[PDB]
Short mmCIF file of N, CA and C and ligand atoms in Angstrom, two decimals:
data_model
loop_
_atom_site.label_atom_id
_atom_site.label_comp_id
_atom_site.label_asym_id
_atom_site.label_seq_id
_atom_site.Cartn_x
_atom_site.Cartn_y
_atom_site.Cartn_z
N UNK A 1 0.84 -1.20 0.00
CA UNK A 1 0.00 0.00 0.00
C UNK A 1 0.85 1.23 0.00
N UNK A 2 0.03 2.60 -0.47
CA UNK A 2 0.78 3.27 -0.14
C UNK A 2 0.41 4.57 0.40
N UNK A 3 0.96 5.65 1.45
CA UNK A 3 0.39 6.35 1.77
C UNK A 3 0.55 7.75 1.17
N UNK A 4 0.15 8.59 1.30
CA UNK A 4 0.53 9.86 0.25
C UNK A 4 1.34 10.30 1.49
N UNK A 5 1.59 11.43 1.10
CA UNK A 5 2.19 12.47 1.29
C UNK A 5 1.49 13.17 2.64
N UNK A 6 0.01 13.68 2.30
CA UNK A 6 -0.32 14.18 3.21
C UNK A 6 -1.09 13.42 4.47
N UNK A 7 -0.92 12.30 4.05
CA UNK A 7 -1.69 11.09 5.15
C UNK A 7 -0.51 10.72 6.29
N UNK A 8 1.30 11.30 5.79
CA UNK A 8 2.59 10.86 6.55
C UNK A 8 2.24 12.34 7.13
N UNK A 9 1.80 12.86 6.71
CA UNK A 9 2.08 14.38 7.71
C UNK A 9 0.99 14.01 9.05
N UNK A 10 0.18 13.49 8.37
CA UNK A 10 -0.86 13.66 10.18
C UNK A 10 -0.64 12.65 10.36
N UNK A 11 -0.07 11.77 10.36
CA UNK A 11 0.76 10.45 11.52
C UNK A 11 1.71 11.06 12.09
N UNK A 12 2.81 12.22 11.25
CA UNK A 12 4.29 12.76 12.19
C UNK A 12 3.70 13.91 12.55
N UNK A 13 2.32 14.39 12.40
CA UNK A 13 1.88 15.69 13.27
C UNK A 13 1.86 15.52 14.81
N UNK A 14 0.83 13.88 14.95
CA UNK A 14 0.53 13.29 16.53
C UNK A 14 1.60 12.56 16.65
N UNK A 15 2.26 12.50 15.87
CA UNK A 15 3.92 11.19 16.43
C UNK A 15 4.70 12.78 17.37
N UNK A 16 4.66 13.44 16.73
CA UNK A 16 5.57 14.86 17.41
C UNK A 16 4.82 15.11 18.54
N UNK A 17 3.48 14.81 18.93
CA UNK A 17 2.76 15.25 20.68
C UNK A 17 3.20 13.69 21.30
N UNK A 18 3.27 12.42 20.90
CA UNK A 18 3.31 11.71 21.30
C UNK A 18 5.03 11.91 22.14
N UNK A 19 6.00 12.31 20.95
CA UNK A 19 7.39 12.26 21.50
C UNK A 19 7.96 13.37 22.61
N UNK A 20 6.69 14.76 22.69
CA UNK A 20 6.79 15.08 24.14
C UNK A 20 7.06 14.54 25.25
N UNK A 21 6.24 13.17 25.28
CA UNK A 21 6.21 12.07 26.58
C UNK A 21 6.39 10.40 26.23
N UNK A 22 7.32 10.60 25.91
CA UNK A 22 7.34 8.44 25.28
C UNK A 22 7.09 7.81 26.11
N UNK A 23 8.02 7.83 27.50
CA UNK A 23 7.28 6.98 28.43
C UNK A 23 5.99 6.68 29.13
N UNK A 24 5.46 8.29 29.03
CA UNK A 24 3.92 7.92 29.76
C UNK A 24 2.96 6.96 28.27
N UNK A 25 3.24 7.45 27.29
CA UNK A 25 2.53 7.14 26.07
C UNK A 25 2.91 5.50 26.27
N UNK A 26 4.46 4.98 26.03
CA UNK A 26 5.01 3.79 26.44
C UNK A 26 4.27 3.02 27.20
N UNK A 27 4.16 3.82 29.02
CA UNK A 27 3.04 2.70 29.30
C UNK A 27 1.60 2.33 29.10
N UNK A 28 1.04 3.97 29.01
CA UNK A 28 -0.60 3.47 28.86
C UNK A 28 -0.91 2.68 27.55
N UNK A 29 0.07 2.49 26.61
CA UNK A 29 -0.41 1.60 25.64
C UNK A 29 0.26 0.52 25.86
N UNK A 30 1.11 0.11 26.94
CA UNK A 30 1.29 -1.18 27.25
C UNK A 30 0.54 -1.46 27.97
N UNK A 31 -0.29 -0.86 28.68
CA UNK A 31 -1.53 -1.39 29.83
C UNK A 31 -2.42 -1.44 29.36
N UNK A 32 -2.97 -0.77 28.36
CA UNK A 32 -4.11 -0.59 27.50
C UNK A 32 -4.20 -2.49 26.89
N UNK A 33 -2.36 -2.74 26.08
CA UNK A 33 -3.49 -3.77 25.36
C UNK A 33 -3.15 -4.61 26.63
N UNK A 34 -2.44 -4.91 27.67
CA UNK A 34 -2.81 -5.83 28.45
C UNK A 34 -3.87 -6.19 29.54
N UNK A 35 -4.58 -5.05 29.40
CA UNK A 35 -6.27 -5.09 30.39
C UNK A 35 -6.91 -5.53 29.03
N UNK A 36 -6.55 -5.56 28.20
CA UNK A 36 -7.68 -5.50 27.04
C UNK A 36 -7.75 -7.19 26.53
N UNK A 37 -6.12 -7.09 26.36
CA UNK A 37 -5.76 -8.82 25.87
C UNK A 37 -4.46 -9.27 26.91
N UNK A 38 -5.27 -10.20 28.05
CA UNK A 38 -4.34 -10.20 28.95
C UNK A 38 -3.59 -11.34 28.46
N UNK A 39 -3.75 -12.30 27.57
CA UNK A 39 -2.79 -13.34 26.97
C UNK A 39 -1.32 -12.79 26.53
N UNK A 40 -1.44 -11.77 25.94
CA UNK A 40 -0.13 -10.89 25.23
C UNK A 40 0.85 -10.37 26.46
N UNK A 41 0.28 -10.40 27.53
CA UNK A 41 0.74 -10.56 29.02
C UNK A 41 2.17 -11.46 29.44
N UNK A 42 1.70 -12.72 28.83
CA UNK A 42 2.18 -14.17 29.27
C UNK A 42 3.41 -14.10 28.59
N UNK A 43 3.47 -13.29 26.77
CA UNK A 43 4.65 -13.32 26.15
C UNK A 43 5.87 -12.01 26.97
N UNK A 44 5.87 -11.46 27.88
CA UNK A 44 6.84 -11.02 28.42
C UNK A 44 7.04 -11.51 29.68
N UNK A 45 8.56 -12.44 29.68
CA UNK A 45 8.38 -13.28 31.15
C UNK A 45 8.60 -12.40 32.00
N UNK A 46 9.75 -11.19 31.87
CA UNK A 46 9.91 -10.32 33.11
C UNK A 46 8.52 -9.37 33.31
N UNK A 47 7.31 -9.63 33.09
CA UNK A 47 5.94 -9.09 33.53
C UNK A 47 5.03 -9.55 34.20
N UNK A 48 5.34 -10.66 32.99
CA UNK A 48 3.87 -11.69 33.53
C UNK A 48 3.38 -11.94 34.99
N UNK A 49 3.89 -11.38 35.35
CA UNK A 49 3.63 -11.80 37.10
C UNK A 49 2.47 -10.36 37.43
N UNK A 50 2.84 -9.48 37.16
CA UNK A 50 2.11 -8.26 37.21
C UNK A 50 0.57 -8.32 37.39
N UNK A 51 0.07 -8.32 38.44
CA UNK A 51 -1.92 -9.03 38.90
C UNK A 51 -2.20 -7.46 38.08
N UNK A 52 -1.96 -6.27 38.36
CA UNK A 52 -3.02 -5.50 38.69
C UNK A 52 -2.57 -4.05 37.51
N UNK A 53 -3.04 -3.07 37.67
CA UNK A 53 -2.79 -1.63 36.71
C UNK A 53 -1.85 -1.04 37.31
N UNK A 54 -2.19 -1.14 38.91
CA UNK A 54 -1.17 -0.31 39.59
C UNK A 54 0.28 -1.05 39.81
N UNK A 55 -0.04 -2.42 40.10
CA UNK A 55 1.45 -2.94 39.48
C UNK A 55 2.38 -2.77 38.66
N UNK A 56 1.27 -2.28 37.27
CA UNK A 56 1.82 -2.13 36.06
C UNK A 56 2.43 -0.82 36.16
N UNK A 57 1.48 0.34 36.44
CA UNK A 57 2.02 1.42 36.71
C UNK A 57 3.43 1.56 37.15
N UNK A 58 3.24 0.89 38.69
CA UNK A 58 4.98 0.96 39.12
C UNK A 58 5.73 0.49 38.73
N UNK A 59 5.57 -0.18 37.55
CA UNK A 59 7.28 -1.02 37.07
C UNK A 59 8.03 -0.57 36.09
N UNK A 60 9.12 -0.85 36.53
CA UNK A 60 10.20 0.27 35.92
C UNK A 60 10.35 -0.58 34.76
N UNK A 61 10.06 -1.59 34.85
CA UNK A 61 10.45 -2.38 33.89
C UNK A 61 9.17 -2.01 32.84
N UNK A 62 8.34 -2.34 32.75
CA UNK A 62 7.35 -2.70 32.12
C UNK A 62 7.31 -1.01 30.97
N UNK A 63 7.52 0.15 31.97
CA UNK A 63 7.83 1.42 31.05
C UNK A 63 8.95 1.80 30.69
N UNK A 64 10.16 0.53 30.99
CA UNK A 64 11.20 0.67 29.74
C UNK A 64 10.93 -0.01 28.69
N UNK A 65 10.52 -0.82 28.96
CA UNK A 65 9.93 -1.46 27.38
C UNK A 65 8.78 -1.00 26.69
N UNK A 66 8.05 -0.19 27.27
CA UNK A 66 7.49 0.54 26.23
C UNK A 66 8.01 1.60 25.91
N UNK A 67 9.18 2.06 26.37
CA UNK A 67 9.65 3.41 25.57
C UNK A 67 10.63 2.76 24.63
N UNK A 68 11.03 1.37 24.96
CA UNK A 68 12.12 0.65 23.58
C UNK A 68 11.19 0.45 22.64
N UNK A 69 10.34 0.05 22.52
CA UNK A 69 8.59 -0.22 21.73
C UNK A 69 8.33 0.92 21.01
N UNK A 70 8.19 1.82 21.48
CA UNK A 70 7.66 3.62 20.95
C UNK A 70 8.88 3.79 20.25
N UNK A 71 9.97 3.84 20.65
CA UNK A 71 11.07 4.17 20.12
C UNK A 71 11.37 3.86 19.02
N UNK A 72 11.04 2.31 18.65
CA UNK A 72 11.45 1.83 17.66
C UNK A 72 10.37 1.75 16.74
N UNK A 73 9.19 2.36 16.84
CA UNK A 73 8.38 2.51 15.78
C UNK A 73 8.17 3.39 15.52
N UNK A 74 8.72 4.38 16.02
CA UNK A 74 8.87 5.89 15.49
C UNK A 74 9.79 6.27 14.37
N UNK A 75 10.57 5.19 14.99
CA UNK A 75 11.58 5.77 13.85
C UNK A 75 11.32 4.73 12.25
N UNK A 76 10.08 3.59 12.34
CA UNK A 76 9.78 2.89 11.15
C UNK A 76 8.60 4.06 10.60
N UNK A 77 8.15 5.01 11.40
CA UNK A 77 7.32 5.84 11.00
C UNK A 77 7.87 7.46 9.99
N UNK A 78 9.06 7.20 10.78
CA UNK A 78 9.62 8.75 10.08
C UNK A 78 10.23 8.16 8.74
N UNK A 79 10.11 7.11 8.56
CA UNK A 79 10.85 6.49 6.97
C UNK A 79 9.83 6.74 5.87
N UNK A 80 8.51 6.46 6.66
CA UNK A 80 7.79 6.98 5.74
C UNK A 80 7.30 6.24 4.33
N UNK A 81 7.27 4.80 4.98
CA UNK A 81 7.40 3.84 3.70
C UNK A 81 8.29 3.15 3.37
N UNK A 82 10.11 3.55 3.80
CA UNK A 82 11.53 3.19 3.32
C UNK A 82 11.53 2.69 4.38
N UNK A 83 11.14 1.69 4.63
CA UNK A 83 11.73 1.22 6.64
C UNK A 83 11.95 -0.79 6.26
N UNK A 84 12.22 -0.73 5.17
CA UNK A 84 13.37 -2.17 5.03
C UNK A 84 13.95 -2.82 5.90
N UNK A 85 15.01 -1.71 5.99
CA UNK A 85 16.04 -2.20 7.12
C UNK A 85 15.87 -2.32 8.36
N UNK A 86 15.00 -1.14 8.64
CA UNK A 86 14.68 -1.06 10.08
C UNK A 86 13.83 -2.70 10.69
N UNK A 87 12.98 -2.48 9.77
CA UNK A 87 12.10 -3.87 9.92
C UNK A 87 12.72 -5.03 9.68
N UNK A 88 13.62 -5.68 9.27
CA UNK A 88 14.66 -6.36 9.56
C UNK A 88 14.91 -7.64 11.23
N UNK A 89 15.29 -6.82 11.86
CA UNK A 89 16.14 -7.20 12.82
C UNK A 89 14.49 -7.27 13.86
N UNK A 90 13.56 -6.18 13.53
CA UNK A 90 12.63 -6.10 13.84
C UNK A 90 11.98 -7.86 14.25
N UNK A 91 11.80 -7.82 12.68
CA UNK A 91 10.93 -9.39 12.13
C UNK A 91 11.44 -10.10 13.01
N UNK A 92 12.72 -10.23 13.15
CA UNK A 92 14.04 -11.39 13.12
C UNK A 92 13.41 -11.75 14.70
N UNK A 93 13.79 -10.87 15.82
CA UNK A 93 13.12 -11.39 16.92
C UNK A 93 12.14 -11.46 17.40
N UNK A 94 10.44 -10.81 17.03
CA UNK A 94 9.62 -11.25 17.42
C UNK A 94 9.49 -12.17 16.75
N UNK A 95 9.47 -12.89 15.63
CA UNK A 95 9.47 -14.46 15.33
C UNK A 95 10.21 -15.36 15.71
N UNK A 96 11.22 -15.35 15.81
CA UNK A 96 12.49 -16.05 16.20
C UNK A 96 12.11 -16.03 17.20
N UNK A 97 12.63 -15.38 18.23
CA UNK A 97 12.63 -14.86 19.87
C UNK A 97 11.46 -14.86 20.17
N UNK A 98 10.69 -13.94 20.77
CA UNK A 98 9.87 -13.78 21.27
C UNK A 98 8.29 -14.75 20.73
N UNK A 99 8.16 -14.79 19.21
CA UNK A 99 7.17 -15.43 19.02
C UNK A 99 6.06 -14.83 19.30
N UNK A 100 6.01 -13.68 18.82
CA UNK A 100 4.48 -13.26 18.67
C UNK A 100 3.60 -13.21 17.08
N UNK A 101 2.23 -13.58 17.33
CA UNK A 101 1.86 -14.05 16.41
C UNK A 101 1.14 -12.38 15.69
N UNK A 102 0.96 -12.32 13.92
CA UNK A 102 0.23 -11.06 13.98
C UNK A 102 -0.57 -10.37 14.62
N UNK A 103 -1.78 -11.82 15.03
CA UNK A 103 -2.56 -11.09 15.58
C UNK A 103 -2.43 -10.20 16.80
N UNK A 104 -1.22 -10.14 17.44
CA UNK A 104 -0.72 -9.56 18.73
C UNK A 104 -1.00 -7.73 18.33
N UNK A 105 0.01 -7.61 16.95
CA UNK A 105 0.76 -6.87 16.32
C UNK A 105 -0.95 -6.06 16.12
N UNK A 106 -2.23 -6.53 15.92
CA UNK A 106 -3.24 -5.95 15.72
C UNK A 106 -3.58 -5.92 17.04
N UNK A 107 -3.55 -6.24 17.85
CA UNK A 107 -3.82 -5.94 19.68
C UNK A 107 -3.20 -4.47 19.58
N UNK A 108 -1.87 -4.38 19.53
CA UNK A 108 -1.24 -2.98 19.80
C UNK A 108 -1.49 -2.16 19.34
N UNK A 109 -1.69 -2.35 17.89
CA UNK A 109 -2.21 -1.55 16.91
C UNK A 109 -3.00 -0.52 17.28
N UNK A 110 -4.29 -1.74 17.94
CA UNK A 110 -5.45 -1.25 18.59
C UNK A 110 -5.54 -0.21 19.57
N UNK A 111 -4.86 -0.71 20.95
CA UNK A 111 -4.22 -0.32 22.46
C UNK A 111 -3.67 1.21 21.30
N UNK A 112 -3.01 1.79 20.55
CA UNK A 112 -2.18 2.95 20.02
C UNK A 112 -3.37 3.77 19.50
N UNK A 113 -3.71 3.57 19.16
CA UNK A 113 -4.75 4.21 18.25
C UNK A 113 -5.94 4.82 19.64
N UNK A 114 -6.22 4.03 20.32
CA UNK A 114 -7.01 3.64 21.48
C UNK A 114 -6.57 5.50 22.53
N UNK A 115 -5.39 4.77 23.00
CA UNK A 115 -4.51 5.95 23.56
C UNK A 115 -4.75 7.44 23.09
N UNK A 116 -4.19 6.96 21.60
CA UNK A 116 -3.88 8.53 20.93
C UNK A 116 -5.23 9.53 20.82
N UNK A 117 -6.45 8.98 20.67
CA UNK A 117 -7.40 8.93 20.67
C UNK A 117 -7.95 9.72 22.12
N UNK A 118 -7.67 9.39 23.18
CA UNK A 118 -7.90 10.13 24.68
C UNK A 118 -7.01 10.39 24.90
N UNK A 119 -5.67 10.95 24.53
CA UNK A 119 -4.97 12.09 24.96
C UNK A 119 -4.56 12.95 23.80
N UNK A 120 -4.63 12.62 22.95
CA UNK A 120 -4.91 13.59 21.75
C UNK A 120 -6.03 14.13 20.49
N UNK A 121 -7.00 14.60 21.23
CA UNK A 121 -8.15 14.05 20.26
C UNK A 121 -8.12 15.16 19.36
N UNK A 122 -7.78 16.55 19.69
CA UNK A 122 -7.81 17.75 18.59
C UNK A 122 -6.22 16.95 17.60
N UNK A 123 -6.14 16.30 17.70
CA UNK A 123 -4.89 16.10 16.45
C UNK A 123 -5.38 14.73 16.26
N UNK A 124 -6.54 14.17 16.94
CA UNK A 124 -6.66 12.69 16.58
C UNK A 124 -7.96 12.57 15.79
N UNK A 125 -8.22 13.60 14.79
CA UNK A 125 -9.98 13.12 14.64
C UNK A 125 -9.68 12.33 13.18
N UNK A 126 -10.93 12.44 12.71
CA UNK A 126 -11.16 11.00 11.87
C UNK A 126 -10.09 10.65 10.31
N UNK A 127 -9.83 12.22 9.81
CA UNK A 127 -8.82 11.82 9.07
C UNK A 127 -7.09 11.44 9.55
N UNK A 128 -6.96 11.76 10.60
CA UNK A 128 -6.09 11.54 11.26
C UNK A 128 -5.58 9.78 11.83
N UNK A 129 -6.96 9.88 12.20
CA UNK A 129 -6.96 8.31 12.85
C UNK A 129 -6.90 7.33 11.71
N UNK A 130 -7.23 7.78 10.40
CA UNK A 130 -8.05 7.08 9.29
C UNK A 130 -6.22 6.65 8.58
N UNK A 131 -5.50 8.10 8.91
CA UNK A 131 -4.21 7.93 8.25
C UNK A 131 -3.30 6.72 9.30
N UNK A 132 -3.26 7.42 10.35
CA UNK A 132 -2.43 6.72 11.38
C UNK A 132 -2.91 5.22 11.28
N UNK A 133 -4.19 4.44 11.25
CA UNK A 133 -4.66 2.85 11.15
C UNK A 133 -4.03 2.48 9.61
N UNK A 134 -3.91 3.46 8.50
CA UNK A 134 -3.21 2.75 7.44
C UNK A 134 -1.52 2.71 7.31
N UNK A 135 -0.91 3.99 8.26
CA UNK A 135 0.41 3.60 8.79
C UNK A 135 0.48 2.40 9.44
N UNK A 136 -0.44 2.01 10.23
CA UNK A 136 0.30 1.04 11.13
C UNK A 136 -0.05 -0.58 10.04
N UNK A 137 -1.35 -0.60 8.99
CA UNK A 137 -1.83 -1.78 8.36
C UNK A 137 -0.55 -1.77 7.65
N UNK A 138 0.04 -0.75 7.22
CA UNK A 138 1.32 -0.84 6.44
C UNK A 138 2.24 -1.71 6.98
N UNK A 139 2.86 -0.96 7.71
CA UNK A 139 3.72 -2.13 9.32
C UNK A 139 3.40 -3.17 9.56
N UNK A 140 2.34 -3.56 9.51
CA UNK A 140 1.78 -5.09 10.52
C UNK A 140 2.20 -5.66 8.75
N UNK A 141 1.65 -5.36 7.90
CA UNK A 141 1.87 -6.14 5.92
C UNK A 141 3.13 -6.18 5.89
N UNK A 142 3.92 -5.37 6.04
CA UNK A 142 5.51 -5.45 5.68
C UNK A 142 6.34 -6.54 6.57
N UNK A 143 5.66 -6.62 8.25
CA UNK A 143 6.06 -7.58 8.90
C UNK A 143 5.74 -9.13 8.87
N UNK A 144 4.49 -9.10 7.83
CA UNK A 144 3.86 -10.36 8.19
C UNK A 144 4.74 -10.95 6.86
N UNK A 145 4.89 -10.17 5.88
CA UNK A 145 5.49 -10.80 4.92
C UNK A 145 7.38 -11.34 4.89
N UNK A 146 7.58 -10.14 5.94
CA UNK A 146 8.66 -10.71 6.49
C UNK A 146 8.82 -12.08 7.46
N UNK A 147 8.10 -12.33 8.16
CA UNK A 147 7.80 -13.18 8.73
C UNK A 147 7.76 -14.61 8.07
N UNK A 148 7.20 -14.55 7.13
CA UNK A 148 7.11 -15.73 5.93
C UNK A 148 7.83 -15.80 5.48
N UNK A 149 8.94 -14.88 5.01
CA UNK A 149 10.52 -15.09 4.66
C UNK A 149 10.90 -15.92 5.31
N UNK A 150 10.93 -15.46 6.73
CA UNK A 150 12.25 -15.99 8.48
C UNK A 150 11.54 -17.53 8.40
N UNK A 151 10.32 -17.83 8.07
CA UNK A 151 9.93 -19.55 7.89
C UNK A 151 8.89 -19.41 9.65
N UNK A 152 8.08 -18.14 9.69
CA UNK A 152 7.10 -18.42 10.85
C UNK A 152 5.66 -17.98 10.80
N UNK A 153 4.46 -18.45 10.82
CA UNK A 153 3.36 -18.12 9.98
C UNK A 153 3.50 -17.67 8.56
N UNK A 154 3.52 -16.48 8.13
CA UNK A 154 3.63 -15.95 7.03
C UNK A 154 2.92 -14.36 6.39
C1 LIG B 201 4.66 -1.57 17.45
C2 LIG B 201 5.08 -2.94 17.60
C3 LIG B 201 6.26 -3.43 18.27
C4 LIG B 201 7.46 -2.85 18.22
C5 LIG B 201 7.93 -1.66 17.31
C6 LIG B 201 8.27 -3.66 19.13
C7 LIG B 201 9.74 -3.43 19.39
C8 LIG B 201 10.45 -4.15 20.27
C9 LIG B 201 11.82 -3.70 20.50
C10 LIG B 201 12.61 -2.62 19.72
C11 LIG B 201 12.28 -4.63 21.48
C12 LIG B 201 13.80 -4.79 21.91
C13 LIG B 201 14.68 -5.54 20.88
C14 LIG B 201 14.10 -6.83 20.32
O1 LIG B 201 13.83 -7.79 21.05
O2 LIG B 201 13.81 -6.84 19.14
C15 LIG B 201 11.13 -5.56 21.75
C16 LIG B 201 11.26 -6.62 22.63
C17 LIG B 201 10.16 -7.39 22.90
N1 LIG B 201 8.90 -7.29 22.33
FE1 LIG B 201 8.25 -6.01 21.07
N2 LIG B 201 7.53 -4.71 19.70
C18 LIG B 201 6.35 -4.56 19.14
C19 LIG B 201 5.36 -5.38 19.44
C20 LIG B 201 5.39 -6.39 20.44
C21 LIG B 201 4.25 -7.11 20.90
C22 LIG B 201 2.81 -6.93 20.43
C23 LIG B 201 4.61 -8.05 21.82
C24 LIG B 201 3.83 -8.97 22.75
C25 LIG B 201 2.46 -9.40 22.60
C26 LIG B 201 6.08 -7.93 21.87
C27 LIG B 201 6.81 -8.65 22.76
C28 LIG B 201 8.09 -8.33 22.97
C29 LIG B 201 8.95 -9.07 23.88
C30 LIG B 201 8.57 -10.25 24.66
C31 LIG B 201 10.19 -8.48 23.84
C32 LIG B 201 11.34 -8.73 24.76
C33 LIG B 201 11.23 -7.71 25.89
C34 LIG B 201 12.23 -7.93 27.02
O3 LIG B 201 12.97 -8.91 26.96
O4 LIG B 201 12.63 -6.93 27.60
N3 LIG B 201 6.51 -6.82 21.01
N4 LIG B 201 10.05 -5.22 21.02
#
């Protein structure tokens, strides 16, 4: 697929309010999809133990990995379509390693959109959101097909 021109501007319009705060953004969309889909839970062993929100809240852990998470899809976002390489090493360990299946990759999707949505809604309305869900269908297609390369679903 492809996105124009002005559909990358209002994804890096709310990517630029989002990068005010990575970590708070980091966690509420890591808590978001795990109240939502608590199975996707189980695939991080240093978490999984985590009962509650406020658990989640306090762990230092849990909002460094969502700012390594944010981090690294920001920068498949500022490519703007050219994100090859980036996606790469990407593919390599959630299939390999970690083993998450697409449908996860549409959990988060969700949980992001979800977020951006109640803390940004004057930069989040419908053409906005409409652009940002075909940035990310982009991402989840480029990965799944990578994925079928590495020899895991496809
Ligand atoms: C926007 C989508 C995602 C991005 C950009 C992303 C990025 C990353 C990055 C950059 C790391 C560190 C390096 C590495 O292992 O590759 C990581 C680790 C990990 N990711 Fe993701 N991820 C995404 C989605 C997910 C999802 C949906 C799950 C779980 C359902 C997942 C589970 C994990 C696990 C288990 C690790 C290891 C974390 C730990 O050992 O600290 N990722 N991810």
């Amino acid at each position: 697929m492809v996105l124009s021109e002005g559909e990358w501007q209002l994804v890096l319009h709310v990517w630029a309010k989002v990068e005010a705060d990575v970590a708070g953004h980091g966690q509420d969309i890591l808590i978001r999809l795990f109240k939502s889909h608590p199975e996707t839970l189980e695939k991080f062993d240093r978490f999984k133990h985590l009962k509650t929100e406020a658990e989640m809240k306090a762990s230092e852990d849990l909002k460094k990995g969502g700012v390594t998470a944010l981090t690294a899809l920001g920068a498949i976002l500022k490519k703007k379509g050219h994100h090859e390489a980036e996606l790469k090493p990407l593919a390599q360990s959630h299939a390999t390693k970690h083993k998450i299946p697409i449908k996860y990759l549409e959990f988060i999707s969700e949980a992001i959109i979800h977020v951006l949505h109640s803390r940004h809604p004057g930069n989040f309305g419908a053409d906005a959101q409409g652009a940002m869900n075909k940035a990310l269908e982009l991402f989840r297609k480029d990965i799944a097909a990578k994925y079928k390369e590495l020899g895991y679903q496809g």
